[PDB]
Structures are given as structure tokens and as C-alpha cells.
Write a protein that binds this ligand. Sequence first.
Ligand SMILES: [Mg+2]
Ligand SMILES: [Mg+2]
Ligand SMILES: [Mg+2]
Ligand SMILES: [Mg+2]
Ligand SMILES: [Mg+2]
Ligand SMILES: [Mg+2]
Ligand SMILES: [Mg+2]
Ligand SMILES: [Mg+2]
Ligand SMILES: [Mg+2]
Ligand SMILES: [Mg+2]
Ligand SMILES: [Mg+2]
Ligand SMILES: [Mg+2]
Ligand SMILES: [Mg+2]
Ligand SMILES: [Mg+2]
Ligand SMILES: [Mg+2]
Ligand SMILES: [Mg+2]
Ligand SMILES: [Mg+2]
Ligand SMILES: [Mg+2]
Ligand SMILES: [Mg+2]
Ligand SMILES: [Mg+2]
Ligand SMILES: [Mg+2]
Ligand SMILES: [Mg+2]
Ligand SMILES: [Mg+2]
Ligand SMILES: [Mg+2]
Ligand SMILES: [Mg+2]
Ligand SMILES: [Mg+2]
Ligand SMILES: [Mg+2]
Ligand SMILES: [Mg+2]
Ligand SMILES: [Mg+2]
Ligand SMILES: [Mg+2]
Ligand SMILES: [Mg+2]
Ligand SMILES: [Mg+2]
Ligand SMILES: [Mg+2]
Ligand SMILES: [Mg+2]
Ligand SMILES: [Mg+2]
Ligand SMILES: [Mg+2]
Ligand SMILES: [Mg+2]
Ligand SMILES: [Mg+2]
Ligand SMILES: [Mg+2]
Ligand SMILES: [Mg+2]
Ligand SMILES: [Mg+2]
Ligand SMILES: [Mg+2]
Ligand SMILES: [Mg+2]
Ligand SMILES: [Mg+2]
Ligand SMILES: [Mg+2]
Ligand SMILES: [Mg+2]
Ligand SMILES: [Mg+2]
Ligand SMILES: [Mg+2]
Ligand SMILES: [Mg+2]
Ligand SMILES: [Mg+2]
Ligand SMILES: [Mg+2]
Ligand SMILES: [Mg+2]
Ligand SMILES: [Mg+2]
Ligand SMILES: [Mg+2]
Ligand SMILES: [Mg+2]
Ligand SMILES: [Mg+2]
Ligand SMILES: [Mg+2]
Ligand SMILES: [Mg+2]
Ligand SMILES: [Mg+2]
Ligand SMILES: [Mg+2]
Ligand SMILES: [Mg+2]
Ligand SMILES: [Mg+2]
Ligand SMILES: [Mg+2]
Ligand SMILES: [Mg+2]
Ligand SMILES: [Mg+2]
Ligand SMILES: [Mg+2]
Ligand SMILES: [Mg+2]
Ligand SMILES: [Mg+2]
Ligand SMILES: [Mg+2]
Lengths: 97, 63, 73
Amino acid sequence: FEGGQLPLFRRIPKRGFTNINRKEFAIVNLDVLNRFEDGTEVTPELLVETGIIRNEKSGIKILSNGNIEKKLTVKANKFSAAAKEAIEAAGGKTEVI
Amino acid sequence: PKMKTHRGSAKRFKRTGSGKLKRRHGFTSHMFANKSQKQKRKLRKSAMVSAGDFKRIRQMVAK
Amino acid sequence: SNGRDSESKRLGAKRADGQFVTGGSILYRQRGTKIYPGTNVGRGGDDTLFAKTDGVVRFERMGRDKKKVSVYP
RNA sequence: UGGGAUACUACCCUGGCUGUAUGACCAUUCUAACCCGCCACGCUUAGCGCGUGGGGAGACAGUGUCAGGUGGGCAGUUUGACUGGGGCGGUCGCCUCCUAAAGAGUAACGGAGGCGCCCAAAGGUUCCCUCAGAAUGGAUGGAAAUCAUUCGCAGAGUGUAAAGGCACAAGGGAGCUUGACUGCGAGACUGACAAGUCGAGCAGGGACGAAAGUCGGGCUUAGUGAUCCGGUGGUUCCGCAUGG
RNA sequence: GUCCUAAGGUAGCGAAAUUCCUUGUCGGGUAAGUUCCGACCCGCACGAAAGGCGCAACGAUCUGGGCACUGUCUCAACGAGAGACUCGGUGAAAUUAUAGUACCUGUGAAGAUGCAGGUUACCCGCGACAGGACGGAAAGACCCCGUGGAGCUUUACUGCAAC
RNA sequence: AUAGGCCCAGGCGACUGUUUAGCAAAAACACAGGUCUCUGCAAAACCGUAAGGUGACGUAUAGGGGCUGACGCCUGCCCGG
RNA sequence: GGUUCGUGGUAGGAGAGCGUUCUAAGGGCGGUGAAGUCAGACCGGAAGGACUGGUGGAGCGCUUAGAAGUGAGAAUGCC
RNA sequence: AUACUCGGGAGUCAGACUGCGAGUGAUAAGAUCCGUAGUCGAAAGGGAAACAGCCCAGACCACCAGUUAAGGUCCCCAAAUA
RNA sequence: GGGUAGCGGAGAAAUUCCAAUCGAACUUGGAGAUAGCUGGUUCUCUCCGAAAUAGCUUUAGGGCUAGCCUCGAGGUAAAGA
RNA sequence: ACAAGUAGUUAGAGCCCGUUAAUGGGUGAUAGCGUGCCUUUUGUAGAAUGAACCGGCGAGUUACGAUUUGUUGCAAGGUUAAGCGGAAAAAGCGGAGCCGUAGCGAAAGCGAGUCUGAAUAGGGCGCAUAAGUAACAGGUCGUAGACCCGAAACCAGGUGAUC
RNA sequence: GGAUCCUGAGUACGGCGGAACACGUGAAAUUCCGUCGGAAUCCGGGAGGACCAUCUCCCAAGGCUAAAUACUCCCUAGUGA
RNA sequence: ACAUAGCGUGAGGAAGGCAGACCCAGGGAACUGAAACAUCUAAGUACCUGGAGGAAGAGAAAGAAAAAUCGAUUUCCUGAGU
Ligand SMILES: [Mg+2]
Ligand SMILES: [Mg+2]
Ligand SMILES: [Mg+2]
Ligand SMILES: [Mg+2]
Ligand SMILES: [Mg+2]
Ligand SMILES: [Mg+2]
Ligand SMILES: [Mg+2]
Ligand SMILES: [Mg+2]
Ligand SMILES: [Mg+2]
Ligand SMILES: [Mg+2]
Ligand SMILES: [Mg+2]
Ligand SMILES: [Mg+2]
Ligand SMILES: [Mg+2]
Ligand SMILES: [Mg+2]
Ligand SMILES: [Mg+2]
Ligand SMILES: [Mg+2]
Ligand SMILES: [Mg+2]
Ligand SMILES: [Mg+2]
Ligand SMILES: [Mg+2]
Ligand SMILES: [Mg+2]
Ligand SMILES: [Mg+2]
Ligand SMILES: [Mg+2]
Ligand SMILES: [Mg+2]
Ligand SMILES: [Mg+2]
Ligand SMILES: [Mg+2]
Ligand SMILES: [Mg+2]
Ligand SMILES: [Mg+2]
Ligand SMILES: [Mg+2]
Ligand SMILES: [Mg+2]
Ligand SMILES: [Mg+2]
Ligand SMILES: [Mg+2]
Ligand SMILES: [Mg+2]
Ligand SMILES: [Mg+2]
Ligand SMILES: [Mg+2]
Ligand SMILES: [Mg+2]
Ligand SMILES: [Mg+2]
Ligand SMILES: [Mg+2]
Ligand SMILES: [Mg+2]
Ligand SMILES: [Mg+2]
Ligand SMILES: [Mg+2]
Ligand SMILES: [Mg+2]
Ligand SMILES: [Mg+2]
Ligand SMILES: [Mg+2]
Ligand SMILES: [Mg+2]
Ligand SMILES: [Mg+2]
Ligand SMILES: [Mg+2]
Ligand SMILES: [Mg+2]
Ligand SMILES: [Mg+2]
Ligand SMILES: [Mg+2]
Ligand SMILES: [Mg+2]
Ligand SMILES: [Mg+2]
Ligand SMILES: [Mg+2]
Ligand SMILES: [Mg+2]
Ligand SMILES: [Mg+2]
Ligand SMILES: [Mg+2]
Ligand SMILES: [Mg+2]
Ligand SMILES: [Mg+2]
Ligand SMILES: [Mg+2]
Ligand SMILES: [Mg+2]
Ligand SMILES: [Mg+2]
Ligand SMILES: [Mg+2]
Ligand SMILES: [Mg+2]
Ligand SMILES: [Mg+2]
Ligand SMILES: [Mg+2]
Ligand SMILES: [Mg+2]
Ligand SMILES: [Mg+2]
Ligand SMILES: [Mg+2]
Ligand SMILES: [Mg+2]
Ligand SMILES: [Mg+2]
């Protein structure tokens, strides 16, 4: 309340809408994949057991942030272009389940 | 009981990564004959909530 | 029947002679050219003088009756 | 005889108007719903009620739902602030000046004025220019019109108040034009916030100019009003199982 | 003449329960009359059923004058009772920061028992009087304020009954 | 001891009545009378959601409502709103 | 532990504490007299705390922590 | 010897007088309204008899010590009948 | 002896009366209504210490942001005086 | 019992005492200085407010959220809720969920970037300059009567015409 | 097995007016009330938030049903920083 | 006229109370909040009335969904102040 001066929130317009079908992915940066042993097949189920992602909202997306050392086989619902390149640049294969 | 979010505010502000509030500008419906194209370009962008205003309203939009 | 006046417009010098300014710094707010745009200084649409480059502000005589403001890097 | 013709003609058609498919619309009559604060009889030792029979009324009235109108009869409320008490009067936003004490800012129901627009050029650019007034001479022609010479820093002009500017003009002509552009924007001013102001420069694509260059309206500073809600145009956005 | 209007106030009455100016003016009444009575009409702003103008009778009605009468008064005196006062019995109340509680002139939140400078003043009571304690009583009813109430009004807004 | 003071003149209200229990008794209200108007009887009007009532066991010489207020003389003009 | 500069204060911010009732644990007092109450010339920088004596006649401190119905001179306060 | 930044917590939005500079007013007001400085507010002490706002000056506590400020030194009344 | 009851009665009308209450009775409840107003708010010492302004406000004796106070933390061509 | 008093205080004889033994106690001739307390105020000794006195009682609390500081545990993680078990225990079990670990965008989406934009431009918000989370305690805020007392009023159901 | 027959009618639903749904008529599905209109009826019908189509899941207009939940005038035994 | 109404007799049953609680239904405020106020809030609350029962209500899909499936209702935690 501003003692009758029109409050800030009414001086400015409402914006946008909420999407009923909004997908939010559980994010996994490369750095945490170094945790795993070399030549290992990283699944969502393996990513929740280990305790890296607890709730797999809409799916698991792999993002680049950090740098991967080990040569893995990572299967996730989505990969960033950079993440895919980086997983491969190390000497691994990405699959999109 | 839980605090209630101010819904008017929740439809107008957006919380940034650093925890500030971003807002739109006012004078951006109608009466556009009365504003310059420079004014229009500027008013079209987003803005941050001022320190003074933020102090007054932050509890209204916690959560 | 009186009782009216407009808001004061805060005209006059905004940077001192000998002060370092960044490009775009308003040097003088004015109606018309009380002071003229010197070297590395522009005159805006409302007659506002602004630095076009970084440097030091210098208010100078133009010749007898007139005055200019320049920005020297 | 005329731009249109006459008859036959067929698509038709205009005023009058008959048959034939509808239809509500009135209008009158009818009785059997409904009604009777009518009579007689019964329940019944009852001026209630109900029943039976007459009479009256009748597709109305009454009653339900829906709709328009009237509607302080009754209800809930609103009916501003400033103010040398309040009321009455005046004022309320914006621009310019003085007050304002040679930065900025600065009050009073202090002193003065303006605004709620205008301009397709009164904008942009290129080129060229110089105003007021007076004196003297001269047809209509007068104190004053249009010529001519001289003197004239501006005594003019600048769409419009005032202040600050402006004669390398920002004033006045002419040619071509639409930068009165789209995306922006280092950085600054102003400022409680909301807003407001200036901006080099970058990109796109232009106008004028031989080029240099200037141009994101107008000499500058008023000419405006948030949000919510609605309308219109666009749209590589969403679309509540899926396609819409 | 002339402008306007739907039409421009008739009779009666009029300085009035109505007249601002105003104690209008004139007359009457009084030694002297802002009131009263009678006239006059320039009716600020009477007027015909929110009736006009009269009017016998009536009125704890209002107004002016007179006679009677009188302590109403000149201007106060005396007497009676009740209370007061003294004694015996009984015995409240409002109020109350503590008080050993003068005056003057000043000062000060601009009106002082209490501050200053002076001036007065032995201690304790009783009968009396009210100048002060901005005395008591009552969170001023006037006045303003409150985005307080309530009652009332209407061609305020929105409604509702009823028709 | 107990038992009207009176007169002249004016305003208002005709009159007897009525009223602010507890600051106003009056010139206020009422009133008889006047006038307008509504009402054909399951009357109009009024109370009630209704039934049921009042009106009225009345019926236009009656009933409801508005205004005026005995009586006398009267009651003008305007229907644009 | 010294040195230097400080230490008026309303609204108000900050800090450290006193005391009250109750709980826990530890350790005590008390019919050879508890609490309360009365008095006093005692102690601490304050809130406060002891001691001695009278009254009283059965309960109460202290330490450390914890929890609060935790402190009154004003409310035309209520009894 | 402070500034600035970011956080937690406020209170304040009746001001007053004095001096100076202005308006309003009558070149009145202990008037009103600004600007500027001070004091009061929230400041005890000394002076101005008394006297928030003037002059001098800032109270941590104790002392029967001292020196000064405004203002004073005949008596009330400390100090010069200098 | 009875009748009329509060969004109501009753009123020869005064806002008049309805249990010493009436411009809308009393009582209980909603109810601890609301009160930008007034009053009040209880132990101690230590350190610091304001404001009575601007802007906007159905705003003017209220509020909000800013200014001025306080506590903590940060950071350096020290930017303050 | 010659005195002018917010009643004390400082100085101080005299008289009277004798202690928690202290540069002690009671009283106070006389002298200096000295306008209660509270509230509210620009300013109150105030001739502004409140209190007769004494005593008792009498006002920021709790719950659930938010936020910030302190503390502790664990830490790129942290933590369980209801519930089961039980003694109105303690553990154990319970990972559903919540917060954090990634942002940008109205959104599709893309992701250490993203949005805007024709842009490989500039600019916004982010990253590069990782710490959170659970619990308790302090401060403040929100919803609740929310520090306490106080209207006039409003509405609902009843009770009253013994006045 | 599927020749035939049955499987809740003034119902469902719709218009109009309201209400309940967190959902204030809204683009308003779903549920109920008043009023008026008014289906299909296994080759059938409903829903998936206007609506149509597809798919999916259901079979209304009949009824009954313990426990886990609420509260305590009571009784018994206990508890309380 | 049959008969119906009516009238009589005999069986069954009801009636009233309350735990100032909880439950379901019919009817349903205002103060208050919105810094005014009318939509909205308070609140389907208070209150009145009826029905109850030891509990009531709900309940065996013309359901929830759309991870591809679940399998009556109720209550708690959560979702989410979304
Ligand atoms: Mg738009
Ligand atoms: Mg000004
Ligand atoms: Mg311009
Ligand atoms: Mg009304
Ligand atoms: Mg109301
Ligand atoms: Mg006013
Ligand atoms: Mg005055
Ligand atoms: Mg005045
Ligand atoms: Mg100046
Ligand atoms: Mg729209
Ligand atoms: Mg779809
Ligand atoms: Mg005479
Ligand atoms: Mg007439
Ligand atoms: Mg008449
Ligand atoms: Mg008459
Ligand atoms: Mg006489
Ligand atoms: Mg006696
Ligand atoms: Mg004086
Ligand atoms: Mg005096
Ligand atoms: Mg004296
Ligand atoms: Mg006195
Ligand atoms: Mg008095
Ligand atoms: Mg008063
Ligand atoms: Mg009063
Ligand atoms: Mg009479
Ligand atoms: Mg009489
Ligand atoms: Mg009386
Ligand atoms: Mg009388
Ligand atoms: Mg009848
Ligand atoms: Mg009359
Ligand atoms: Mg009559
Ligand atoms: Mg000091
Ligand atoms: Mg101090
Ligand atoms: Mg504190
Ligand atoms: Mg005890
Ligand atoms: Mg005792
Ligand atoms: Mg207490
Ligand atoms: Mg007391
Ligand atoms: Mg001054
Ligand atoms: Mg003054
Ligand atoms: Mg003060
Ligand atoms: Mg002083
Ligand atoms: Mg003195
Ligand atoms: Mg004082
Ligand atoms: Mg000395
Ligand atoms: Mg000396
Ligand atoms: Mg001497
Ligand atoms: Mg009475
Ligand atoms: Mg309530
Ligand atoms: Mg109360
Ligand atoms: Mg200090
Ligand atoms: Mg406003
Ligand atoms: Mg105040
Ligand atoms: Mg003596
Ligand atoms: Mg003597
Ligand atoms: Mg008193
Ligand atoms: Mg906290
Ligand atoms: Mg009412
Ligand atoms: Mg009764
Ligand atoms: Mg009687
Ligand atoms: Mg409906
Ligand atoms: Mg709803
Ligand atoms: Mg459907
Ligand atoms: Mg229907
Ligand atoms: Mg359906
Ligand atoms: Mg759908
Ligand atoms: Mg939906
Ligand atoms: Mg079926
Ligand atoms: Mg309010």
C-alpha cells in the first residue's frame, strides 16, 4: 500500500501466459558424468540410483557446462548440441531414448 | 496459515537469476500518437524493479 | 488569477572545466546556444552539449561575445 | 415520330386483384377446464369448509416462469481537497518569466502570461539570399499599397506565451525529396517511484549533394493521461486425450 | 410607444405575526411614546381555499392605554414562625498531587498563593461575605476535523416492493 | 372563614376541545362547514406472503384520500412547463 | 595489559544484566525455627543482594540450564 | 577522518525563536511563507532580576583545590568605593 | 378485563408515546464490530542518536518511497572533510 | 507562637543518642539554592490533561507462513511428511514431497547461454567470480482480536402496551 | 451361442431465470433448482473444460452398505515446567 | 340409485425432551475488509427451522486418466498459495 498513490503493480501491464503442456527437463552437466567408470552405459535409471537426478521432470537433458574425460555411452531424452559433440569428442555415443 | 502470493504482482513481475524482479513498462497501450518512436523503442523493453519499490513489495511475491 | 509556474528544468553546466568525461556525458543543458559545441562536442536537438569522445572538458572564449565547450583527450 | 417502338415474342414488370399451400392476426359465438364474497340440498344443532344440483362468469380471470415500463413507497450508499477557522468565491495537469539571495533546487489563496495544438511544408537536403523603419523622387494613390536610390547589427523575423538563442543565420527564396526511417544504442542528465530528457556510434535500406557531408521531424523548452477492460490488423507462439 | 411572456397581480388589504432602508411621514395618546392606535402608499419581499378581506361571541393567547389598588418603587422600618447560632443525641456528600497556601509590580504557554524584586504579616479558632483558586458538576451541545454514525429529502447513483 | 377586579382599543385563532409525561398550551392540532378527487361493490383505500380481514354486516345522500377551516362578502389572470 | 580519542540526550537502534513463578539435574538449609512479615547505621556501578534481631510456625534457597500469566505510579482503569 | 556499497531495525512528515537575505502584510504582529546560519526541540551549568529559542558554554562520578568565558567588582552579592 | 410490537405499533400531529430508554424500545447473540482518534503500556545500566523535509496521495493531525538515526558485513588511486 | 514555606537540598550551631563502627544515628536555630509527577506539546510550575490515599489486579502473546542474523549437523547436496512401531518415549522404518545443484524466453523452445533482431552487431537477464539445506534461537513482516481499554452505530433471534 | 426380446422418459438434454462448482457468464465444460420445450433407447447412450471429428474410458435417469473421520452432556483410570 | 364422503369401534404408531457439541437439510444477515463504496468480502458464517445418528454425509464408475494405465467412498500428508 502507498497511501492511495496507485501501487507499483497497477502502474505496469500483465505479461504472457502459462503453457498447459510446458516440459521442464532434469539437467545433467557433463562434469558429474566423470563420476562414472570408463566404457560404462549411463541410463536415466543409473542417473537416479547413483543419486545425480532424484526427480526426472519431463526427462533428462545433458548440457555441456564442464568438460568430460571418460569414454561413456550416455542415453537421455535430450542433449544440447555442445553436450552431444563433447560426449563424442571424448570417444562415446549418445542415444535419444 | 501460509502467506498468500499477491496474484496481481505474480502476473506482472518475473524473478531473475540474481533474485531481482523484472517488470514491463507502463505507457505501452494506446495513445501511441503521443509518444515518439524513440520513446516507443525504449518502453517496449523490460525494466528492473527499483530498490525502493523492491523493499516495499518483496514479501508480496516471496514464492 | 496567478498561482502557476512550470517545473524547473535543471539547466546549466553538468561537468566542470578540467574534469575527465566519458563519451556521451552531458556537459551543458540550455535553451538555445548560451554556450556553443566546441571540438569533440555535439549539440543535441534541445541544445544539450554532450562529449562525443572521452577526455577533459574545457570552457573557452569563441571571440569577444560567445563561449564554447570542448573535450580534449 | 425517338437516345428509347409499335406486332409476334420470351426473361420479365408496374398498378389493381381472383383461384390455390401456409400462417399467424383479429373479432364474434360456444362449454367442458378454471373461478364465484350467488341460490337450493347434504355432511350438520356450522354466516368455515367440502360435496351434489341450479344459476353466473369463462379460455378471460387467477396462479407459475420470463420480459419491458413506472417506481424516495422502501433500501444501500456517494456527495473531493486546498483554505491565515469553515462556508461562499477561486484553484487543481502542463509550459515560460519574476519572486530565487550570480551552480542546481526553493514557499505563499505571491507578481505576470500561455497550453490541451498546428504544419505534406511551417519536415529533409542542396544552392542562393537579408530584415524593421526613415529620408528624397515618383500616375491612379490618401499618414500608409507597388517602383527607385541612400542610411540602416537588427530597431525585423522566427506557426503559437515567455525566456534563452539565431544575420557562417535558427530569418527569406527556389530545385529535388519523405530520415516526420526499421533494428538499436557506449554513455550521460533528471529523478522517491512511475515516468521524463539527451546521445556519439553500429547495422539495414534510403533522400539531397559533384563531393565533404547532413537527415531517426519543426530555433529550443507546452500541445497530454497510467493500469484493467474492450475493438481492429498482423503473427516461423500456446491450443486441457489427439487433429482442429 | 417599445421588448419580452403561458400570462404579467383583479378585488381587497398594506411600514403588516410580512417594510431592509426605518424610530419612514403625518396625526392621536404622554410633560416626554424606537412600542400602541389612525392615516398615507416607493408592497426591499401582501393578495385571494399552503385562501383574501371582515367579523358578534369566546381565550390562564399576544399587544397598547385607563381606573381601582397597593412595600413594585422613592427607601426602607418593625414584628411572628422555620432554619441559622449554643448545648445534648445521631451523623452523610460532592471534591481532594503533596501543601507551613499574603499583597503589589513584573515575569512566564502572552491573566501566578507557589517564579523575581519589593511590601506587609505573632500562633489557633468561631460567626459572616463570595473576589480568586481560569472553583465543583458534565472527555463543549457552539466551531472545525473523521474517506465516524444516524434521521430526513430529491429530477444524486444503484437497487427492491408494488403496480 | 370561604365566594368576580373592572374598563377602552388592537393582532391572531370563529367557538367547547387537543398538544411537546419531565423547559414551549400557543397564533400550533382538531373542529363544524367548503372544495377537489377516487370508489358500481369480491368498491376504492388499508393490513397480510397468502388465507383471512378492516372498509361494512355499509352501497355514491356511501366510503377512502388531498387541501381549506364557523359565519359574512368574495375567490381575478395563466394549461407554455 | 598499555596508549590515544571519547562518555548531555527525546523518538529510536544496539549491547550487557537484575529480579519474579515454574521445571530438570546437582548440591544444600530448615522445629536448635522454612517462607512471609517488621526493624536496622551492611554490600554491589544500577536493577538489586546479604547479615543480625523481633514476629511467624513449615517449608525454602543455591549452582547450571530451560520455560514464561515475568516487574506498574498514572488508563475520568477494575475490586 | 571519514566516504561508498549490500543487508537487519527504526523513528520523523504539528516545529519554535534569533540573526541575515526576500515575498505576503502597513518596510505592522511573539504574523505568515521561503532561503541561510545558530540555539531550543533532545541541553543541565554561568549571565540577561525572574525569562525553551539571546550572550557565554556542553553535565561519566567524587573533592571544603586551581585557571578562565559572558557578565561583573558601594551594599543586598563573590570581586576595584581601581 | 382485553387488542395493536420495533423493517413494527399508536399519534385532535409534538419527532409525540410504546415500563424513569425513542429521528426508531429492551435483551441476548454476530462480538474482542470497526476507531488513520484520545488515553494507557510495568526492571536497570552502557554505546550511538534523529526528524518535524521532498515527492505522490478523497491527501493534508494518516500513509508510502526518498532524506536524516542505528546494528552487521564488504570492498579499495581512499573515494570523505 | 516576627514568620511568606513544591517543603527538600547544601552549609550549620545547639541538644539528644550510641551503630551491621562507619571521616556514625535523631532533631534542626540560622544561611544559600530550589516552580511536584505524568501525559501532550514549537513551548507546560503551569491558570492544559490524569491521579483522594494505600493494596491487589491491569497492556507486543501464541499458531502457522515469509524474510534476515546467530548457532549446530551434513554438504553438491540437504531434509523427510502423513504414517507404522512404541511408554502421550527413544530409535528404527517411511524419499511421496520440498529446497538447492542453470539460466534465458510471453511461449514453442534453446541451454552457459538465451531473448530481442535480417545480424556472425549491439543491448537485457544470466554464466564465467559453486553453497546449499535441516533444525533451533533473536529481529521484523503477513494471516489471525494480534499491545490494552473505549464509541456512536449495523444485523439476527427473542422479551415488553401492569407506564 | 447372438434369430428375436430387455437393460430406469416427461427422463437425458436444450432455451430462459438462478444457484453450486476455487471458477463472479465468462470461450464455460461439470452439478442442481424453477419454468417452458423435449431425445436416442444397442446399428444405442455419456464423458475426456465451448464445439466437431477420431480415439480412449465409461453405461445415467432405482436402492443399500462396515472401517479409516467429527464431536463429548457423561463414566472409569490417569496425566500436566 | 349403486356408492362415496361422513360417523363409530378395535388394533398398531406418533407426539415431548435434549450435549449451548459433532452431522445433514430448508431459510439466511450485518458490522467488517476493499484504507470511501455499489460488484466482491465478511459467509453460506451467526442465527432460526426441520431431520436425525452414534456418528452423520459419501460410496461400488455413464469415474480418474492419457508416464499406458488405474479400479467404490471417506480421512491424513503432498501437490500449492501452484
Ligand atoms: Mg497493445
Ligand atoms: Mg517552482
Ligand atoms: Mg525535436
Ligand atoms: Mg434514501
Ligand atoms: Mg455498509
Ligand atoms: Mg477542507
Ligand atoms: Mg486567521
Ligand atoms: Mg478564512
Ligand atoms: Mg539560481
Ligand atoms: Mg483480449
Ligand atoms: Mg486438444
Ligand atoms: Mg404621534
Ligand atoms: Mg386561485
Ligand atoms: Mg392558493
Ligand atoms: Mg386562514
Ligand atoms: Mg405606559
Ligand atoms: Mg450538636
Ligand atoms: Mg510577557
Ligand atoms: Mg501576572
Ligand atoms: Mg514575590
Ligand atoms: Mg495553582
Ligand atoms: Mg470549572
Ligand atoms: Mg471533547
Ligand atoms: Mg462531543
Ligand atoms: Mg382557539
Ligand atoms: Mg379552551
Ligand atoms: Mg414540556
Ligand atoms: Mg407548560
Ligand atoms: Mg377482501
Ligand atoms: Mg390551515
Ligand atoms: Mg373538512
Ligand atoms: Mg560531556
Ligand atoms: Mg549517554
Ligand atoms: Mg532493542
Ligand atoms: Mg514459594
Ligand atoms: Mg504478613
Ligand atoms: Mg503481567
Ligand atoms: Mg492504584
Ligand atoms: Mg530565519
Ligand atoms: Mg511565528
Ligand atoms: Mg516532541
Ligand atoms: Mg540551557
Ligand atoms: Mg538566575
Ligand atoms: Mg522543558
Ligand atoms: Mg572555579
Ligand atoms: Mg582569577
Ligand atoms: Mg563583597
Ligand atoms: Mg419513557
Ligand atoms: Mg464478526
Ligand atoms: Mg469492544
Ligand atoms: Mg553522543
Ligand atoms: Mg485519487
Ligand atoms: Mg503527530
Ligand atoms: Mg520566635
Ligand atoms: Mg517585625
Ligand atoms: Mg482530577
Ligand atoms: Mg526468524
Ligand atoms: Mg438498515
Ligand atoms: Mg407480546
Ligand atoms: Mg388498562
Ligand atoms: Mg443455468
Ligand atoms: Mg462461485
Ligand atoms: Mg460435453
Ligand atoms: Mg431447465
Ligand atoms: Mg453433458
Ligand atoms: Mg478436450
Ligand atoms: Mg480448465
Ligand atoms: Mg446402462
Ligand atoms: Mg476503511
